[PDB]
Amino acid sequence: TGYDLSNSVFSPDGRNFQVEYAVKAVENGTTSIGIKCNDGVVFAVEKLITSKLLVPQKNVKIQVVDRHIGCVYSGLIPDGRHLVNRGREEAASFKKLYKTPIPIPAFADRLGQYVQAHTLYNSVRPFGVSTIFGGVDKNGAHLYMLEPSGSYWGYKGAATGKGRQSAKAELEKLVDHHPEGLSAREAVKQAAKIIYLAHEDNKEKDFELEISWCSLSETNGLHKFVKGDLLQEAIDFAQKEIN
Amino acid sequence: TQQPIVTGTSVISMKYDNGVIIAADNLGSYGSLLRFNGVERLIPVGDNTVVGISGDISDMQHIERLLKDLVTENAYDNPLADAEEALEPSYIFEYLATVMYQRRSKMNPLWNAIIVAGVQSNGDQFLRYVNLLGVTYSSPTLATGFGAHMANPLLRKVVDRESDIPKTTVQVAEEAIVNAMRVLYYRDARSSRNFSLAIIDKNTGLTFKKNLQVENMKWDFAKDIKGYGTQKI
């Protein structure tokens, strides 16, 4: 063997073991999710409070791309940042040539092709993050999740990291119980809840919650962070539900 | 090496006690042809800065895209993007000045004259000029093109040195600006009647007025003027 020592080598079953090893780094990361809603998308993430000494609210992890796209990811944080920097260059170049802001499906393939390119050669390592991202364009809201292999699809809701299973089950209930749709303000609340539920699988250290959203009606189709009254209102709705 | 095709004429501006005013007409000339009539040459950046541009319009449109990409870029990984880490007028200016001088130094200029007007975060008025050579300067009043020749003398009667700024109100300043725009319409063959005006005040923020018009024009004395010397009828 030794098929697993070098990126881009097919094993005899037809697998790239280095990508599968990158997936292990993703599973070891904190939980993050996205919920697609009526006219928008909501992103949230668990930030482990390592120590008293972290400044609350001041280690932001959700990232904006252009003005209409949010990205969150689990795994190696720097890899996620590198991927978002590339996403930003891709969005700028699309807008520069075509004038309109980059459509979300278009943006999803730019990230996909770039991540897939890092499975083509033994001189690079695959990305150690799964990335949940999306926003609003001329065709509505879109949510996407993208793996170290470069695999991505459109999602009704999505989750990754240590609590991906608990979150997935929780997301599935919402999809079954709301076939007409979930509102943006509703989806923010559910997001808080699921991050709290999913924090079960990671309960050594307690955590700080972070949410963001794009909604045609609630944020004018722009990406904004949920802070202040709306954040606390959703923290409380989550607290209520674990008790 | 370049020649301006579609151009915009003067941009005029002055400081007053609480802020800055800046104005520019809505015309895009094509030589002597008054080709385009709804052209906005004042471009706001955030809620604290207006960038006024004369000269080549294709380059103006390029500068708009630079500025709107600057806003986008500044918001990236910046939780204080609409607060302590919002773009200052001075940041926007230095960036444009840097670009203008680099482009002149590569012998491929952006064929423009630019005035950046706004209020800093500490309430200070900002007014600075940069052009295609990358020359920069500040003054209580600033104007480009014919504006430098005909507006500055009028606006200097109101604010002639730094100490006249606290003594000047937004009503006085706007009046002086609006009058200067009329004079330029009388005397500049590449001006238009229609213009935009913007006030950036430390208390009231940014007010941006569109579709203003030069009014109260004296033309009546024209009926008495006959011939070019000796002709009586």
CB-count burial class (<10 Å; 0-12, 13-18, 19+) for A234:
buried
Q: Give me the torsion for CA of B76, B81, B87, B91, rounded to 10°.
A: -60
| Total tally of structural domains belonging to chain A | 1
Output phi, psi for B96, to 5 deg.
-65, -45
Question: What CATH number should be reported for the domain holding residue A43?
Answer: 3.60.20.10
Element (H, E) at A173: helix A164-177
Amino acid making up residue B52: G
Which active-site residues of A does the annotation give? Answer: 30
Q: What does the DSSP assignment read for A192-222?
A: HHHHHHHGGGG-SS-EEEEEEEEETTTTTT-
> Which range of residues forms the domain containing residue B198?
1-233
Strand A152-154 versus strand B49-56 pairing type:
unpaired
Question: What CATH number should be reported for the domain holding residue B230?
Answer: 3.60.20.10
For chain B, the three-class secondary structure string (H helix, E strand, C coil) is CCCCCEEECCEEEEECCCEEEEEEECCEEECCEEEECCCCCEEECCCCEEEEEEEEHHHHHHHHHHHHHHHHHHHCCCCCCCCCCCCCHHHHHHHHHHHHHHHHHCCCCCCEEEEEEEECCCCCEEEEEEECCCCEEECCEEECCHHHHHHHHHHHHHCCCHHHCCCCCHHHHHHHHHHHHHHHHHHCCCCCCEEEEEEEECCCEEEEEEEEECCCCCCHHHHHCCCCCCCCC
The alpha carbon of residue B145 and the mean position of all alpha carbons in its chain are separated, in whole angstroms, by 10
Task: List strand residue ranges (DSSP E) for A19-148, in order.
Answer: 32-37, 40-48, 63-65, 69-75, 129-137, 140-146
Q: Which residue of A has its CA nearest to B69?
A: A92
- Rounded CA-CA distance B198/B52 in Å is 10
Q: Which of B228, B141, B214, B156 is nearest to B182 (CA)?
A: B214
Q: Cβ–Cβ of B75/A64 closer than 8 Å?
A: yes
- Rounded CA-CA distance A145/B125 in Å is 47
Output phi, psi for B220, to 5 deg.
-65, -45
**CB-CB neighbours of A10 under 10 Å:** 10
> Which range of residues forms the domain containing residue A82?
1-243
- Rounded CA-CA distance A66/A145 in Å is 18
The answer for residues whose C-beta is within 8 angstroms of residue A123's C-beta and 6 or more apart is none
The alpha carbon of residue B100 and the mean position of all alpha carbons in its chain are separated, in whole angstroms, by 17
- Rounded CA-CA distance A239/A48 in Å is 17
Is A225 near chain B, with CB under 8 Å? Answer: yes
- Rounded CA-CA distance B160/B169 in Å is 14
Amino acid making up residue B151: A
Q: Could you tell me which residues of chain B have a Cβ less than 8 Å from any Cβ in chain A?
A: 65, 69, 72, 75-77, 79
Token pair 């079954």 in the structure block, residue: A176
Token pair 């998308």 in the structure block, residue: A41
Identify whether the C-beta of residue B155 lies closer than 8 Å to the C-beta of residue B14. Answer: yes
Amino acid making up residue B20: V
Identify whether the C-beta of residue A216 lies closer than 8 Å to the C-beta of residue A136. Answer: yes
- The DSSP 8-state label assigned to residue B101 in this structure reads H
Between A58, A92, A225, which is nearest B69 by CB? A92
CA distance A92 to chain B (A): 8
Amino acid making up residue A5: L
Best to test chain B binding among A88, A211, A219, A224 (most B CBs inside 10 Å) = A88
- The DSSP 8-state label assigned to residue A159 in this structure reads E
The answer for residues whose C-beta is within 8 angstroms of residue A48's C-beta and 6 or more apart is A30, A202, A205, A207
Question: Hey, is B222 helix, strand or coil?
Answer: helix
Residues comprising chain A, all counted: 243
Identify whether the C-beta of residue A130 lies closer than 8 Å to the C-beta of residue A147. Answer: yes
Instruction: Quote the tokens at residue A178.
Output: 């709301």
| Total tally of structural domains belonging to chain B | 1
Q: What does the DSSP assignment read for B125-163?
A: EEEEEEETT--EEE-SEEE-THHHHHHHHHHHHH--SGG
CA distance B69 to chain A (A): 8
Amino acid making up residue B137: Y
- Rounded CA-CA distance A103/B209 in Å is 33
Element (H, E) at A152: strand A152-154
Token pair 């500490």 in the structure block, residue: B122
